[PDB]
Amino acid sequence: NGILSDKQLNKEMEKIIKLRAGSPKYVQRRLCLIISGWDLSRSDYEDKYNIIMKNGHYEKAAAWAVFFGDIPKAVEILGSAKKERLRLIATAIAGYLAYKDLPGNNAWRQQCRKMSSELDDPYLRVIFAFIADNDWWDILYEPAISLRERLGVALRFLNDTDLTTFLDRTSSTVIENGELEGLILTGITPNGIDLLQSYVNKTS
Amino acid sequence: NGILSDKQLNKEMEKIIKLRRKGSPKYVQRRLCLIISGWDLSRSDYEDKYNIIMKNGHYEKAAAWAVFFGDIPKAVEILGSAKKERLRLIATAIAGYLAYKDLPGNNAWRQQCRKMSSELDDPYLRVIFAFIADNDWWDILYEPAISLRERLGVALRFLNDTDLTTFLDRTSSTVIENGELEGLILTGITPNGIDLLQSYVNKTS
């Protein structure tokens, strides 16, 4: 949201990226990716996949692969897992790559929608809800997944016209609800102190 | 194999067919084999049998029979809304084939289906995955864990006569020496059936 001059703030934001376009506000997106911890490279993406897999969380690695758009990598990661249910889920996700050219409206899309509705694991629910009717607004609005991982796809795979609307709605939600994950948006600003005050009022 | 005139036995066998009437050359023998094996049932009675198998609780056998009779969307509908989540996952995997059968092959989805066919314990879903991953019946006709009556049904329904004769010869020569009691569908209660029962008595007492 910006805020001594506009060119002055633009150049001090630029010098942070010039320490370590395609959009009207590109350097702000880079700074928001730096703040949210979502400026990892492809080799860093593979390292994060390996680290997440090393804890036994295969579903989290598949969700991270889908979040960055590497759906065949999610197929590979959930393949050769330690669970038969995970292998069935991997086959279901693998039944999308040849399907992306289709207009849709299949009974398979209805099966994926029902499975995303009935599943208890939030990451697999994210995958099955994203694979059928492939839009990003069905993933970045639920509260089951972390707000950091939601901003990992809102700042990366979404445009600045609706990004300000999403950020405004999420900030207005977390200020009055008092969720500690709103500190992604507000930081430790005085608005962050207001968020913490609502958190103290709600939870002591 | 057949074996006093050929035309007279053919016409009385056609009369045998024309008893319950309320593109192959051997249609006066395939229909007799379907009568003998119990696979000359109507489609409404097929729906009734699907309801019966679903009411018995064997959803995997109902899915296998739907795959055998070809209505793969009905297999998806039967395996969906079942008592298990695993069956729903299998239904999603099965449904991932209808918009996929035009693909040339050697892709990761078919590799995953072949891996699932290799690893899974249920034989009905094993042959379901074997038929879904590759559209060939020969991985289904030689699976021993499924019943031989179903295999003969899907051999008389979908096979050329030059291949059905080889399948019948192979399966009969297997079940005569192996002593399998389900070879009596192929051989009948004949002297060769007595040879089958003699081998069964030798193996099992």
Side-chain angles (χ1 to χ4, degrees):
Chain A
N1 279 331
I3 304 177
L4 308 183
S5 178
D6 202 12
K7 193 185 183 179
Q8 200 262 358
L9 65 90
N10 281 348
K11 70 183 58 179
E12 57 90 5
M13 278 201 195
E14 270 170 2
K15 81 171 71 174
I16 302 300
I17 305 307
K18 299 163 191 173
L19 185 77
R20 194 175 78 190
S23 166
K25 318 211 293 203
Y26 179 56
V27 286
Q28 301 196 346
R29 286 189 98 165
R30 302 292 299 125
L31 269 295
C32 287
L33 280 189
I34 287 287
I35 294 298
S36 198
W38 288 121
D39 208 356
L40 314 161
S41 79
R42 287 209 196 88
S43 65
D44 301 330
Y45 282 172
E46 295 181 347
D47 289 334
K48 284 305 282 289
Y49 294 156
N50 293 321
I51 285 163
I52 285 159
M53 281 155 61
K54 261 172 180 179
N55 307 353
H57 284 94
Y58 287 142
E59 310 100 5
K60 188 159 180 167
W64 271 53
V66 161
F67 282 158
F68 299 142
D70 292 331
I71 305 180
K73 212 146 205 169
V75 168
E76 182 200 5
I77 280 175
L78 258 185
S80 80
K82 288 181 175 181
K83 285 206 284 190
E84 182 190 357
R85 178 190 139 193
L86 284 188
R87 290 203 265 174
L88 281 166
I89 289 158
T91 313
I93 297 160
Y96 155 78
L97 317 172
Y99 188 76
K100 63 168 183 304
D101 309 343
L102 272 300
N105 267 313
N106 210 354
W108 177 89
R109 269 212 215 271
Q110 293 144 25
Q111 269 294 310
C112 285
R113 279 178 194 150
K114 252 64 170 190
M115 282 290 248
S116 75
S117 82
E118 68 95 19
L119 267 174
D120 56 355
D121 193 0
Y123 288 141
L124 312 172
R125 165 183 319 131
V126 160
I127 309 315
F128 281 164
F130 171 66
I131 284 303
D133 193 20
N134 46 3
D135 70 324
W136 285 118
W137 279 344
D138 214 7
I139 303 307
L140 60 83
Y141 286 162
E142 70 179 4
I145 48 179
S146 160
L147 194 43
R148 215 181 52 102
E149 280 185 6
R150 287 199 255 144
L151 265 193
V153 311
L155 296 157
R156 156 180 293 111
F157 281 144
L158 192 147
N159 213 359
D160 68 319
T161 56
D162 295 329
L163 187 57
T164 183
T165 72
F166 163 70
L167 284 190
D168 187 39
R169 297 285 75 78
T170 318
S171 162
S172 54
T173 294
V174 300
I175 280 296
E176 61 97 19
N177 278 116
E179 305 274 320
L180 285 187
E181 283 207 43
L183 304 173
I184 309 287
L185 309 177
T186 178
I188 322 292
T189 51
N191 305 355
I193 306 302
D194 292 354
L195 180 138
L196 287 163
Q197 175 66 78
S198 47
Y199 183 59
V200 165
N201 291 135
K202 195 179 58 76
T203 45
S204 309
Chain B
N1 210 6
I3 310 176
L4 312 177
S5 168
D6 200 15
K7 186 192 181 182
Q8 196 262 337
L9 68 94
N10 277 311
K11 67 183 59 175
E12 65 89 21
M13 214 173 292
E14 280 159 356
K15 190 253 290 179
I16 283 302
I17 287 301
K18 294 166 201 173
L19 191 59
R20 221 154 60 233
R21 287 278 95 86
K22 325 281 174 190
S24 56
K26 280 151 95 141
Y27 196 63
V28 304
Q29 284 184 6
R30 279 172 88 112
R31 283 300 290 263
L32 276 296
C33 297
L34 288 181
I35 287 284
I36 279 285
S37 195
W39 292 121
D40 205 0
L41 199 65
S42 67
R43 283 212 202 92
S44 46
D45 293 332
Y46 280 156
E47 303 187 355
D48 298 333
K49 280 226 159 188
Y50 286 153
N51 290 321
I52 282 169
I53 296 174
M54 283 154 69
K55 274 170 180 179
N56 292 351
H58 287 99
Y59 279 104
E60 301 99 341
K61 192 177 175 171
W65 273 37
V67 162
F68 281 167
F69 287 124
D71 49 357
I72 308 299
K74 199 164 182 180
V76 173
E77 189 199 6
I78 284 175
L79 264 189
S81 82
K83 294 180 176 181
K84 293 204 283 190
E85 196 174 4
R86 178 184 134 192
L87 295 186
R88 302 210 258 171
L89 289 166
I90 291 156
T92 315
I94 287 158
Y97 155 82
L98 316 173
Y100 191 82
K101 60 176 183 307
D102 302 336
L103 269 298
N106 279 313
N107 199 357
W109 191 87
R110 290 195 214 276
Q111 279 148 14
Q112 272 291 324
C113 285
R114 286 196 203 95
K115 284 292 180 182
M116 284 293 292
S117 81
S118 80
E119 68 94 19
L120 186 59
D121 52 340
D122 271 315
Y124 288 138
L125 312 163
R126 259 165 175 251
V127 308
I128 278 170
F129 279 153
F131 177 64
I132 287 304
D134 199 27
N135 278 302
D136 67 316
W137 301 105
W138 292 110
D139 302 315
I140 318 300
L141 295 172
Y142 293 130
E143 213 277 332
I146 64 185
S147 177
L148 186 45
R149 212 179 48 108
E150 298 172 2
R151 294 192 279 148
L152 264 181
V154 309
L156 297 153
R157 275 181 260 123
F158 304 106
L159 214 48
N160 299 319
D161 305 348
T162 62
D163 283 350
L164 180 60
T165 310
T166 62
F167 168 73
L168 278 183
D169 190 359
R170 182 149 180 177
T171 303
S172 176
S173 70
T174 308
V175 298
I176 286 304
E177 59 99 17
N178 268 355
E180 294 284 317
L181 270 191
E182 290 181 59
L184 292 172
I185 295 93
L186 281 85
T187 186
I189 312 186
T190 43
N192 311 321
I194 295 315
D195 289 352
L196 181 137
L197 288 150
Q198 171 75 82
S199 50
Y200 169 70
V201 162
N202 296 332
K203 190 183 71 92
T204 58
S205 296

